[PDB]
């Protein structure tokens, strides 16, 4: 099932329709003195506004 940030409601059988949501789960480390943290902000909104950097 594709879960974007906007959530997904699935209905299976004769239950009541249930809902899932996706919080921010991308994983770099977000901080470091040798940083390599531009990967983190590629984790949110990827292939978008990395062209600005």
């Amino acid at each position: 099932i594709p879960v974007p940030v906007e959530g997904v409601e699935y209905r299976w059988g004769n239950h009541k329709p249930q809902r899932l949501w996706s919080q921010l789960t991308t994983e770099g480390r977000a901080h470091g003195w040798p940083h390599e943290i531009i990967e983190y902000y590629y984790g949110l909104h990827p292939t978008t506004t990395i062209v600005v950097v």
Binding site: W21, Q23, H31
Partner: protein, 433 residues
Amino acid sequence: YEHTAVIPNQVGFPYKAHVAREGYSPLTLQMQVVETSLEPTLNLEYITCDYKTKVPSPYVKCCGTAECRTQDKPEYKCAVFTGVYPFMWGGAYCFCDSENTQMSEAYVERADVCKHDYAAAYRAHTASLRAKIKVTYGTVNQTVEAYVNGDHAVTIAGTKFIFGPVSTAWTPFDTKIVVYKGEVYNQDFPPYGAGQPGRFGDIQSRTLDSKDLYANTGLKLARPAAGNIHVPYTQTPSGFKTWQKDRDSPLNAKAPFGCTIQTNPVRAMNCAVGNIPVSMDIADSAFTRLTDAPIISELLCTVSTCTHSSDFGGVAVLSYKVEKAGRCDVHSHSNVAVLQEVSIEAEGRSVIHFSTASAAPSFIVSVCSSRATCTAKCEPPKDHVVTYPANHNGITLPDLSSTAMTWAQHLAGGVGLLIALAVLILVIVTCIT
């Protein structure tokens, strides 16, 4: 006093309205939305149902002929036939072998169950939203029911509340939808007089009682074979039941924004779009005199841990001094964070639960006419998927916070000073002119 605010139109998001009314104890208030029924205005033209090919017993004779009437009825078909000589239960029926002539006739009338199920072709239009929200300010915890077009606005607890009208007049519908027993289908329909037989809309009528009705069911009758007395007739079967088994797309599985569909009356529910304007005519009696207010000096803040979660993950204890205590209030002065409860119990130190989405927030604080900052770093949560929507409608990623931005601050670039040296050595080249 009068004030105006906005609110995001979903369920669950608690919204805070912190009016800065000087000369008084400050005030914040909470509104939470517990329904959004979006009904359009129906305008039907026809219905449908399976028909019944009702046929009377055939007129038989020999030894002479007859004719037919064609009275005012739906699709009166009839014809005589020359040479029909049958058998019977015993022996025969006539002895006029070259004159045995049989008439037959049949027509179309709505079935018995046409009083019980149909498909109304609704030409609905001009939707209008509703809401059932609850408001809590100081000595209030009561709910309210509100239309959201700019007109209807009355009261609660002796204060006047007005909601809307909407930001963007959007519908999750179409112009020409169809209904069924409990569902909604976004499709076309025949034009009430182009009822090509076999497809949808092969018979129709303006209502349940329009005593004349359209039909183009291709009905035609042929002549029987010898011996047995019966009547043959051919037409495409009742296309309504054919349309029953190939529906293949309801609205409750395809409508956008998860805004679910219900019927009787036809409405949509919990549309997650847009925002709502709101205006308040708030009475004085809710307020409290700043003489009797809690006086608080030397306010500070700090944090303990942050969780970059969906739930109220961040816990921030709060250092503040005291000189006289009471019932104080608290609010965030940006869009970045949100706060859990609307008040504290003023005793020495407090704990609050705040929620964010950007891992470096600088929501400052607001507490009883004393504003002071505190910033915190955060950390993503160990989990991936959850079972409740966000509580952090300010999903605003880039904060400055001087933590990752400070490298861009360390992109200063005094090579502009070098450019200035280039221009100056040009000048001292020019000074020997």
